[PDB]
Amino acid sequence: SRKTYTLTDYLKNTYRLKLYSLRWISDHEYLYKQENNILVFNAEYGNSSVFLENSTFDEFGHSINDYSISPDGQFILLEYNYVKQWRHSYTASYDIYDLNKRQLITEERIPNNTQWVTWSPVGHKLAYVWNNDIYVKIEPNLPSYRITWTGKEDIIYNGITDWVYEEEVFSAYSALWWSPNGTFLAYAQFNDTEVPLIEYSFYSDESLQYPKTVRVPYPKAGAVNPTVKFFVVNTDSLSSVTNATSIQITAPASMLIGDHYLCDVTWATQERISLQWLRRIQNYSVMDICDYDESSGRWNCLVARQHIEMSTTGWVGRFRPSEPHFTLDGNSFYKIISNEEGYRHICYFQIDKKDCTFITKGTWEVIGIEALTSDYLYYISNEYKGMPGGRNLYKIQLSDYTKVTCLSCELNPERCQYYSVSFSKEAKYYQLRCSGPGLPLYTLHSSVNDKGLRVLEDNSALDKMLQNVQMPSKKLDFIILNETKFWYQMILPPHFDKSKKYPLLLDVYAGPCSQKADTVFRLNWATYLASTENIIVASFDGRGSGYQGDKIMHAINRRLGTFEVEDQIEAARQFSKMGFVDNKRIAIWGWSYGGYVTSMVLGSGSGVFKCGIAVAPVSRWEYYDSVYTERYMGLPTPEDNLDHYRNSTVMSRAENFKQVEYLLIHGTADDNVHFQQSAQISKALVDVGVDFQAMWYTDEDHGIASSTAHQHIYTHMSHFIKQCFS
Amino acid sequence: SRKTYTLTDYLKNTYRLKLYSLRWISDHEYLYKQENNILVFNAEYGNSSVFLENSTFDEFGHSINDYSISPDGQFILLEYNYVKQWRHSYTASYDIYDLNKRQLITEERIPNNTQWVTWSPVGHKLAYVWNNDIYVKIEPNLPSYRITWTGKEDIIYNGITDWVYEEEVFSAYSALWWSPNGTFLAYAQFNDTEVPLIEYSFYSDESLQYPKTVRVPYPKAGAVNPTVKFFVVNTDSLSSVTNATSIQITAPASMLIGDHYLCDVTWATQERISLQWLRRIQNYSVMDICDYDESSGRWNCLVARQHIEMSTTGWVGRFRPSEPHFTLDGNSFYKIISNEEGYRHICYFQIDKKDCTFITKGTWEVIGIEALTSDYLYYISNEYKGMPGGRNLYKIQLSDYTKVTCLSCELNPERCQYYSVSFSKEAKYYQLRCSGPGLPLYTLHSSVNDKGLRVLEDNSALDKMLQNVQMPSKKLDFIILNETKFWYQMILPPHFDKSKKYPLLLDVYAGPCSQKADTVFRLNWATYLASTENIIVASFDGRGSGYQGDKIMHAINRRLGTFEVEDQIEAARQFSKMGFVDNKRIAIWGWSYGGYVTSMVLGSGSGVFKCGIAVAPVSRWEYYDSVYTERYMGLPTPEDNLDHYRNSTVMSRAENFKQVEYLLIHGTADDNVHFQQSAQISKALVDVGVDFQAMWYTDEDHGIASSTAHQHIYTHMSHFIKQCFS
Ligand SMILES: *C(N)[C@@H]1CCCN1C(=O)[C@@H]1CC[C@H](CNC(=O)Nc2ccc(C(=O)OC)cc2)N1
C-alpha cells in the first residue's frame, strides 16, 4: 500500500499534532492564541471575541516570542530578545502595553537582560529579577522599588535559582512567590560562594579566534553545596526613599544542624505560607507553616504546626516532597505521601495535628492533586484497569471518601487512557487533555454535573493524513519477574507478523521513578524505525520505575546501576523468547540516564545485545550533580556509600565492550551531563583496546536540539542502527 | 608464500630497525651506549673499553631516563622524574655523579622541576633554568649563582623559550648559548605579558572530579606577539655576593621599528657572537656581529658588520634564516642563502663586506653545512642524479671551488641514496648514516683520505627477518605539469601487477618546504596497507614543496590552501590514469597541515576522492600560531591578507562534503593545532546537513602518541579505509 512514516517525515515534521493551549483568566473565560491574534472564549457557550489583534504590534520593531497578560486584563507583557540559558532559565527584554489606553508604556521600562518577570496573582503589580536582584513595580509606568542589593553574578542569587536548584529542585529559574492577593512577595536567596565551577570550552561562531571558557557554579556529588535563605516582603509597605525590609524566615533547627535544601514553598492564605525543607541526606523533610504577625511585622512558624515527612526505605517524595493543597481557611491541607504499603495516596492534615488521614488507598497511585473545592478534591491517578501507564481524572467527595467518581475513564476508553487536566480559576469548568493511545483529543466540561460542553480539538486533520500511511501499532503489556509484574511497550511495524523474526531496539531511560511504558500517542524516531525500517522498538519499566509503589521504586536505593540495568537485560531476554524477535539483532539506546544504562548493559558482558548507542551518558556518579545523585546514592565517602559509587562506573566495564558495537555521542557544551563523562568512557575504551564509534556535537548542550544538530544526530544514529541490523 | 607485514606488526614493532647512536667526546673517541652500559670507542682502530658499568646505579632509587657526560669526562648528569611539556620542553630532576671519586654529589644539588640544564662546551660548568630563572654552577658541588630574577610563570622566560618560540623558531626549549670556551653565557628573555591564552580542558585520571582548564600564552595569527631581549654574561666575573651583571645586546634599529623576532644566535669566536633578527613580516632579516669590548665590559655590534637577507618572492630561509659557519678566526663565514635563480647554495662572506660569493651553484640545493675545516667545507645536498629526494655528503676545497668531491654517492648506490652525517670534534672522523632506499647502514670513515674504516651496523638481523615476509616495494618517480617536474612516491603491494587496478590512498602533508617523496626506508602504517591490504599508498610533492628552488617553494606565498591542494588533486588525477589504479577507490589522508590539505581537497568538489581522513587538521589560519602562519600568509588585516585568510578555510567548503565519506580525528589536549579547529569543521558540516565520522582522543596532544591512543587511532583508521575500499 501507500507510503511509510520516514526519517524525513520525523525530522521535517510533515505530520503535525494539533493542540489547544488555552489560558484561563477567570472562572468563566479563557484566552486562546492563534498564529496571529488572541481570542477570548466564554466557556459556557463557546462564543468568542478578539482580545487583541495580531497587527497591533506590526511595527513594534522587535520579534515578540511571548506575551503575558496581567491577571487584570489591563496590561500585556511583551517578551523579546530572548536568550536561552539552562533548561528553564533565560534572559530577555520586556515592554508593557497598556490595553486600556492602547499605548506602549515608554517610561521606567523593565531593563534589558532581565532574568525573570512575573505579574502578581491578581492586580497588575510586577516583580522582576535583573543582575541577580529583585525589583517590584506597583504600577507599570512607575519607578521600580529595589528589594535586594546583594546580587552578585555566579555567587548571590535573589529571586532566581542557581544551576542545581533550577535543574533539580524547582524545575524553574524563578525563586519568588507572590501571596494570594499580591500583598506579599516571598523569595529565596542562594549563595554559591564555595561551590566549585565546572569549566568547558565554547567555540562559538567561526569568527571567534580564541575559544571561550564557560564556568558555572555546579556542585558534583559530595562537593560543597550552595546555601539558601528565605525572605518575605510586604509590597504595600515600601517607600522609594527607604530600602524595603525583607523579613527572613529561618530554621528549622532539625535542618540547620547540617547541609539542607529549601524544596517547596506554597502560600496557604493571605497571611500564611508553608515551606518544606529537606536534609542533604534526602531521607528526612520538614514542613513549616508560618503566620504573619500583625503588630510585629515578622513571620512566626509555630512548632506543632510543622510536619515531618521521612522514609526508611528510600528518599522522600517522587523527586522531592509533594506540595500541599490548603483548604480555603488554610487550617487543613491535602498532600500526596507514601502509604504504609508504600503507595502514594492523598492524606488529609489539620495544620496543628501530627497524624493525617489517607482519603484514598489501593495498589495504584495518585499522580497529582489538580483542584480543590470546598466540595470536592480533583486528582489524577493510574487506578483505572490497574494500568500504571494510564492516567485518569477523578473527584472524591470530601464529605464521604467512599464516593469517588472517575470523570474521564469512560469518555472514550478506546482512544483515551491518558489524561491531564486544566481547571478554570474556581474550578467551574475544566479542559481534559487526552494524549493517547489514540490521537490527542481536547474537550471542555462544566464541573457542576461534569457535562461535556464540546470538543475543542480532535486532530481530524492529522487523522486524514495518516490513513494514507503505513503506521506502526503499539502494544502495552507486562511480564512477570518473581511474583511482580513489570510493564513494557513495543512499537510494532505495520502488518506485524508474529511468525516473523524482527530485529529489536530497546529504547531505555530507566532512571528512578521513570516510566517508559505508557498509553501516550507519539510520533518520533521510533515511529520511523518501526514503520520504515521494520524494527520493533521496545521499552521496559523494571525496578526503580515509578507510579507502582515504593517496593519497586526504592528497589535501587543507594544502588544505582544495579537492578535497573539488570532488569533491562532480563526484559530483552524475555522479548527474544516471545517468538517474533531475532535474538541475533537486539540493540539498545538511551539518552542521559538512558545513556548510562545503555553503557552499563553493553559492558555487562551479558552478550544479549549486538550494538548500542549512548547519548550524553552519565559514566560515574561522582561527576553528576549533588541534589540528584545523592538523593539515591547518599554521599561518596568511606563512611557512607563511596564503595558503590566506585563500583557503578561505566569505565570499570570497558573490557566487556569488545563484544559489542558501540556509538558514543555527546554535546561539547553540555552543562548538565558534562562532556567529561563521555571523555572518560572513551579513554577507558582506548586504554583497553576496544574499537567503537563516536560523535561530538560542537557547542550543543544536553538537548542537542538545534535544528541542524537534531537532524544530524538522528540521521547518524539511523545509519548506525541499520548497519548493525543489516 | 609466507606472511605479510600486518597492522599488529606495525603496532607491536615486531620488525625493529637497529641504529648506532654514538656521541663524539673528542676528535678520536665516541661513546656508544647499550641497554646496560656505556662504552668508549677508539675511532681509528675500533677497540673499546667500558666507560661506566650498567650496575653503577642499581640502587640510585630512581628510574634514569637519560645521561649527559660533561665534556670533561669528569662528571655525569643523571636525569630522572622526566615530565614532558610541549614538543621539546620538559622538566626533570637531576643528580650529578662524580666520575673521578665515583661518588654521587649530594650538596647544592640541582633543584627538582628544572626546566633546562646544559654543560659548558668544554670544562664542567653548568647552566640551568628553574622557575624561569637562569642559574650557573662553576663546579658541580658548589652553590649556584643566580643570573636572573625576573622569571615569572607564563610571563617572563629567562633562558627558555615560550610556546611559540619553542615550536616555531628554535625547535627547542633552550634559549641559552655558551661561548666556545665557556667564558660567556648568552641568553634570550621572552615576555608573554600581553599574549592571549589558549584555554582547553584536561580531564586527567578518572579520579579527578572537576576537569582542569589548561591555559598557555599562545599567539594566533595577527594577535599580540611575545617580545624578546638578548643578554650576555661573563661567568668568570661572578661573586656570590654581587648580583651578576648581564649585558644586553639590543637593536638593530631596522627591527625595533616594529614587531620582530630573534631567529638565530651563533658564536663566532671566544669574544664574538652573531645574532639574526627577523621582522614580523618575515620578508626581511638582519644579522649583527658583536664583539666583546675588553675595557668597557659591554658588547658592540658594528654596523657594516651586519648583513641583510631579504626575499622579494617570499619569506626568508626554508623555515627561518640559515645559521652561519665561521672560519677559525671569525673573520669570514659560510651560510646557505637563496640564489639569484632561487636555489639555496653556500655563499662565502667577509664579516665586514656586504657582497658574498657563492661557492656552489646549480639546479639543486644544499640541505645543510655539516662541518668546516681550514681545508674543506662538508655539506649535504640533493645534487646526485638530480634527485630532490636524495641526500649525499660532499666536500668542497676552500682553495678551489672547482674541486667538489662526493663522499657517499658511490659507497653503495643501490642500497644508499639518503645520508646524514656526524663528524668528530675536529672532523678527523665521521659516521655516515644511510637511511634508504635499502635497510639503514651505519659506517665510520677517516677524513684525511675519506677511507672507510668499518661497518658499525648493517641491520643484517632485520634483513633476515624480512626475507620471510611479503614486503611492499617503493617507486620514486616524477610527472610533468606545464614544463616542471614534480616528484611522487608509491608504496606498492607485493607482487605488484601493473595490469591490475588497485585502490589508492594519497598520504599527504604538503606544507611549505615539505618533502613527502624521498628515498628513505620506512616501516609504518603505509607498509601494512600495501603489504596486507594491497593498497597503493602514494605521496606527491607539488607547488610549495621544498629542496627544489624558490620558483616551486614560493609558489604558495600569501596563498596557503591553493596550489598545494590543487596539485594533490591533479596528482591523483594522473595516478588514476597510469593503468593500475581503480579510479573508483581513491582516498586521501593527512595529519596537521596534511589534515588541512586533506579537508580542503575533500571539500573542493573535485569528486576525484571517495573518502578521506583528517587528523588534527588546521581549519582556518587565524586559529594557528603567528610565527608559522604569518610567515606564509602575512597579517589577517584588511590592509594585508585578510581576504585570503577568509577564503582558505575548510568551513566554507562544507557543502561539498556531501559527495565524500569523511573521518575527522583530534586529540582534546592538542596544544599545537587546537581541538577548536576540528570543532569548527564539525559544526559547519552539521549546519549544512553533511554526515561524517568522528573520533576525539581524550587528553591526547598533537601526537596522539600514547601507547594506547596510538594503537587505537591506527586501528580505527584501518577499519575506515578498508570499509571505504571494500
Ligand atoms: C601541523 N604540522 C601544524 C599545521 C601547520 C603548521 N604545523 C606545525 O606543527 C608547525 C610546522 C613547523 C613547526 C614544528 N613542527 C614540524 O615541523 N612538524 C612536522 C610535521 C610533519 C612533517 C612531515 O610530514 O614531513 C614530511 C614535517 C614536520 N610547527
Coordinates of N, CA and C in Angstrom, one line a residue, chain B residues 300-399:
Chain B
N300 N 79.7 45.4 21.5 CA 79.4 46.3 20.4 C 79.2 45.6 19.1
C301 N 78.1 45.9 18.4 CA 77.9 45.3 17.1 C 78.0 46.4 16.0
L302 N 79.2 46.4 15.4 CA 79.5 47.4 14.4 C 78.5 47.3 13.2
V303 N 77.9 48.4 12.7 CA 77.1 48.3 11.5 C 78.2 48.1 10.5
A304 N 77.9 47.8 9.3 CA 78.9 47.5 8.3 C 79.4 46.1 8.5
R305 N 79.1 45.5 9.7 CA 79.5 44.2 10.0 C 78.2 43.4 10.0
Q306 N 77.1 44.1 9.8 CA 75.8 43.5 9.8 C 75.4 43.2 8.3
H307 N 74.6 42.1 8.1 CA 74.2 41.7 6.8 C 72.7 41.5 6.7
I308 N 72.2 42.0 5.6 CA 70.7 42.0 5.3 C 70.4 40.8 4.5
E309 N 69.4 40.0 4.8 CA 68.9 38.9 4.0 C 67.4 39.1 3.8
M310 N 67.0 39.3 2.6 CA 65.6 39.5 2.3 C 65.2 38.8 1.0
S311 N 63.8 38.7 0.9 CA 63.3 38.0 -0.3 C 62.1 38.8 -0.9
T312 N 62.1 38.8 -2.2 CA 61.0 39.5 -2.9 C 59.9 38.6 -3.4
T313 N 60.2 37.3 -3.4 CA 59.3 36.3 -3.8 C 58.6 35.6 -2.7
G314 N 59.1 35.7 -1.5 CA 58.5 35.0 -0.3 C 59.2 35.4 1.0
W315 N 59.2 34.4 1.9 CA 59.8 34.6 3.2 C 61.3 34.3 3.2
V316 N 62.1 34.6 4.2 CA 63.5 34.3 4.3 C 63.8 33.0 4.9
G317 N 64.6 32.2 4.1 CA 65.0 30.9 4.6 C 64.0 29.8 4.4
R318 N 64.4 28.6 4.7 CA 63.4 27.5 4.5 C 62.3 27.7 5.5
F319 N 62.6 27.7 6.8 CA 61.7 28.0 7.8 C 62.1 29.2 8.6
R320 N 63.4 29.6 8.4 CA 64.0 30.8 9.0 C 65.4 30.9 8.4
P321 N 66.0 32.1 8.6 CA 67.3 32.4 8.0 C 68.3 31.3 8.5
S322 N 69.2 30.9 7.6 CA 70.1 29.8 7.9 C 71.2 30.3 8.9
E323 N 71.8 29.3 9.6 CA 72.9 29.7 10.5 C 74.2 29.8 9.8
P324 N 75.1 30.8 10.3 CA 76.4 30.9 9.7 C 77.4 30.0 10.3
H325 N 78.4 29.7 9.5 CA 79.5 28.8 10.0 C 80.8 29.6 9.8
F326 N 81.3 30.1 10.9 CA 82.5 30.9 10.9 C 83.9 30.2 10.8
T327 N 84.8 30.8 10.1 CA 86.1 30.3 9.9 C 86.8 30.5 11.3
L328 N 87.9 29.8 11.5 CA 88.6 29.8 12.8 C 88.8 31.2 13.4
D329 N 89.2 32.1 12.6 CA 89.5 33.5 13.1 C 88.2 34.3 13.2
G330 N 87.0 33.8 12.8 CA 85.8 34.5 12.9 C 85.7 35.7 12.0
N331 N 86.6 35.8 11.0 CA 86.6 37.0 10.1 C 85.8 36.8 8.8
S332 N 85.3 35.5 8.7 CA 84.5 35.2 7.5 C 83.6 34.1 7.9
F333 N 82.6 33.8 7.1 CA 81.7 32.7 7.4 C 81.0 32.3 6.1
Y334 N 80.5 31.0 6.2 CA 79.7 30.4 5.1 C 78.3 30.3 5.6
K335 N 77.4 30.4 4.7 CA 76.0 30.2 5.0 C 75.1 30.0 3.8
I336 N 74.0 29.2 3.9 CA 73.1 28.9 2.8 C 72.1 30.0 2.6
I337 N 72.1 30.6 1.4 CA 71.1 31.6 1.1 C 70.6 31.3 -0.3
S338 N 69.4 31.9 -0.7 CA 68.8 31.6 -2.0 C 69.6 32.4 -3.1
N339 N 69.8 31.6 -4.2 CA 70.5 32.1 -5.4 C 69.7 33.2 -6.1
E340 N 70.2 33.7 -7.2 CA 69.6 34.7 -8.0 C 68.6 33.9 -8.9
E341 N 68.8 32.6 -9.0 CA 68.0 31.7 -9.7 C 67.0 31.0 -8.7
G342 N 67.1 31.4 -7.5 CA 66.2 30.8 -6.5 C 66.6 29.5 -5.8
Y343 N 67.8 29.1 -6.1 CA 68.3 27.9 -5.5 C 69.2 28.2 -4.3
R344 N 69.0 27.4 -3.2 CA 69.8 27.6 -2.0 C 71.2 27.0 -2.1
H345 N 72.2 27.8 -2.1 CA 73.6 27.4 -2.1 C 74.4 28.1 -1.1
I346 N 75.6 27.6 -0.9 CA 76.6 28.2 0.1 C 77.3 29.5 -0.4
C347 N 77.1 30.5 0.3 CA 77.7 31.8 0.0 C 78.8 32.1 1.0
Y348 N 79.9 32.7 0.6 CA 81.1 33.0 1.4 C 81.1 34.5 1.7
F349 N 81.1 34.8 3.0 CA 81.1 36.2 3.4 C 82.3 36.6 4.2
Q350 N 82.7 37.9 4.1 CA 83.8 38.5 4.8 C 82.9 39.3 5.8
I351 N 83.1 39.1 7.1 CA 82.3 39.8 8.1 C 82.0 41.3 7.9
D352 N 83.0 42.0 7.3 CA 82.8 43.4 7.1 C 82.6 43.8 5.6
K353 N 82.2 42.9 4.8 CA 81.9 43.1 3.4 C 80.5 42.7 3.0
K354 N 79.8 43.6 2.4 CA 78.4 43.3 2.0 C 78.1 42.2 1.0
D355 N 78.9 42.1 0.0 CA 78.6 41.1 -1.0 C 79.3 39.8 -0.7
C356 N 78.6 38.7 -0.9 CA 79.2 37.3 -0.6 C 79.4 36.6 -1.9
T357 N 80.2 35.5 -1.9 CA 80.5 34.8 -3.1 C 79.9 33.4 -3.0
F358 N 79.1 33.0 -3.9 CA 78.5 31.7 -3.9 C 79.7 30.7 -4.3
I359 N 79.8 29.6 -3.5 CA 80.8 28.6 -3.8 C 80.2 27.4 -4.4
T360 N 78.9 27.3 -4.4 CA 78.2 26.2 -5.1 C 77.1 26.8 -5.9
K361 N 76.7 26.0 -6.9 CA 75.6 26.5 -7.8 C 75.0 25.3 -8.6
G362 N 73.9 25.6 -9.2 CA 73.2 24.5 -9.9 C 71.7 24.4 -9.6
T363 N 71.0 23.6 -10.4 CA 69.6 23.4 -10.2 C 69.3 22.2 -9.2
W364 N 69.8 22.5 -8.0 CA 69.7 21.5 -6.9 C 70.0 22.4 -5.6
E365 N 69.9 21.9 -4.4 CA 70.1 22.7 -3.3 C 71.0 22.0 -2.2
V366 N 71.7 22.9 -1.5 CA 72.5 22.4 -0.3 C 71.5 22.3 0.8
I367 N 71.4 21.2 1.4 CA 70.5 21.0 2.5 C 71.1 21.6 3.8
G368 N 72.4 21.4 4.0 CA 73.0 21.9 5.2 C 74.5 21.8 5.2
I369 N 75.1 22.7 5.9 CA 76.6 22.7 6.1 C 76.8 21.9 7.3
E370 N 77.6 20.8 7.2 CA 77.8 19.9 8.3 C 79.1 20.1 9.1
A371 N 80.2 20.5 8.4 CA 81.5 20.8 9.1 C 82.3 21.7 8.3
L372 N 83.2 22.4 9.0 CA 84.2 23.3 8.3 C 85.6 23.2 8.9
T373 N 86.5 22.9 8.0 CA 87.9 22.8 8.5 C 88.6 24.0 7.7
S374 N 89.8 24.3 8.0 CA 90.5 25.4 7.3 C 90.8 24.9 5.9
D375 N 90.6 23.6 5.7 CA 90.9 22.9 4.4 C 89.6 22.8 3.6
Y376 N 88.6 22.1 4.1 CA 87.3 21.9 3.4 C 86.0 22.3 4.1
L377 N 85.0 22.3 3.4 CA 83.6 22.6 3.9 C 82.8 21.3 3.5
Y378 N 82.3 20.7 4.5 CA 81.5 19.5 4.3 C 80.0 19.9 4.3
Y379 N 79.2 19.4 3.3 CA 77.8 19.7 3.3 C 77.0 18.6 2.6
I380 N 75.7 18.6 2.9 CA 74.8 17.6 2.3 C 73.9 18.3 1.3
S381 N 73.7 17.6 0.2 CA 72.9 18.2 -0.9 C 72.1 17.1 -1.7
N382 N 71.2 17.5 -2.5 CA 70.5 16.6 -3.3 C 70.9 16.7 -4.8
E383 N 72.2 17.0 -5.0 CA 72.7 17.1 -6.4 C 72.7 15.8 -7.2
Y384 N 73.2 14.7 -6.5 CA 73.3 13.4 -7.1 C 72.1 12.9 -7.9
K385 N 72.3 12.6 -9.2 CA 71.3 12.1 -10.1 C 70.1 13.0 -10.2
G386 N 70.3 14.3 -9.8 CA 69.3 15.3 -9.9 C 68.0 14.8 -9.2
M387 N 68.1 14.1 -8.1 CA 67.0 13.6 -7.4 C 66.8 14.4 -6.1
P388 N 65.8 15.3 -6.1 CA 65.5 16.1 -4.9 C 65.3 15.4 -3.6
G389 N 64.8 14.1 -3.7 CA 64.6 13.3 -2.5 C 65.8 12.5 -2.1
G390 N 66.9 12.7 -2.7 CA 68.1 12.0 -2.3 C 69.0 12.9 -1.5
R391 N 69.9 12.4 -0.6 CA 70.8 13.1 0.2 C 72.2 12.5 0.2
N392 N 73.2 13.3 -0.1 CA 74.6 12.8 -0.1 C 75.5 13.9 0.5
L393 N 76.6 13.4 1.0 CA 77.6 14.2 1.7 C 78.7 14.6 0.6
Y394 N 79.1 15.8 0.6 CA 80.1 16.3 -0.3 C 81.1 17.2 0.5
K395 N 82.3 17.4 -0.1 CA 83.3 18.2 0.5 C 83.8 19.1 -0.6
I396 N 83.9 20.4 -0.4 CA 84.4 21.3 -1.4 C 85.7 22.0 -0.9
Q397 N 86.7 22.0 -1.8 CA 88.0 22.6 -1.5 C 87.9 24.1 -1.4
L398 N 88.2 24.6 -0.2 CA 88.1 26.1 0.0 C 89.0 26.9 -0.9
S399 N 90.1 26.2 -1.3 CA 91.1 26.9 -2.2 C 90.7 26.9 -3.7

